[PDB]
Design a protein around this ligand. Structure first.
Ligand SMILES: [Zn+2]
Length: 230
């Protein structure tokens, strides 16, 4: 993979791996999946302000190249938030390893970049509720409501959603065909709390699909008391 000029590098691996050696100048950022509630404009503006503080503290600016060992959930989750904030991002999953030589962590000066939410990358609960096609990337047992995590009130799925377990997205060849999709089509993706839905989002976008990521996912849906199946 070729790199764009003057790129800022972000390493999404766990800290010990980062400290054992990272690309010169790369910042460490391995974001966990927050449980977000995005219903009011003020909540969307708070997510945005949080990304601004993050971007400035890490000295980020476009273009950003994020790297990790393979297409990991943390790489995708982290890259999704940076791109969601308006930064131009790219994922680098192989080929950077020979350059992971730096042990010292950079202490860049803050930048003054300001995040601006990219609404076409996102789905709020209300937008997801009106979406023509949502893909639930959890396991079939979760999709069928047979099991659920203890932080949620019951097992279930968003009504009308279709199950596309995450593992399917690791085999892009013929994926759209198998999922019954085509380039340009509007598709939403979700899971429990947006932890791994970004993997499906990036894979689908790379295939030309207008994918949108419902970060709130099942957890927000259930906390809101929205309609569910079974
Ligand atoms: Zn939950």
């Amino acid at each position: 993979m070729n790199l764009p000029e003057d790129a800022v590098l972000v390493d999404t691996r766990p800290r010990p791996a980062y400290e054992a050696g990272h690309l010169p100048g790369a910042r460490h950022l391995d974001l966990s999946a927050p449980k977000l509630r995005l219903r009011e404009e003020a909540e969307l503006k708070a997510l945005e302000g949080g990304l601004t503080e993050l971007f400035q503290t890490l000295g980020l600016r476009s273009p950003v190249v994020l790297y990790d060992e393979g297409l990991t959930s943390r790489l995708c989750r982290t890259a999704f938030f940076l791109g969601l904030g308006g930064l131009e991002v790219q994922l680098w999953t192989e080929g950077w390893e020979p350059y992971a030589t730096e042990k010292e962590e950079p202490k860049p000066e803050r930048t003054e970049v300001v995040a601006k939410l990219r609404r076409d990358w996102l789905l709020t609960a209300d937008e997801a509720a009106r979406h023509p096609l949502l893909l639930d990337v959890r396991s079939p047992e979760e999709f069928q409501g047979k099991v659920h995590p203890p932080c949620c009130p019951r097992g279930g799925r968003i009504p009308g959603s279709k199950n596309a377990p995450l593992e399917l997205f690791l085999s892009p060849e013929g994926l759209l065909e198998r999922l019954g999709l085509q380039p340009g089509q509007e598709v939403g993706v979700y899971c429990h709390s947006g932890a791994r839905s970004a993997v499906a989002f990036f894979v689908l976008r790379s295939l030309g699909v207008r994918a949108r990521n419902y970060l709130g996912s099942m957890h927000e849906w259930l906390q809101e008391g929205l309609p569910t199946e079974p």
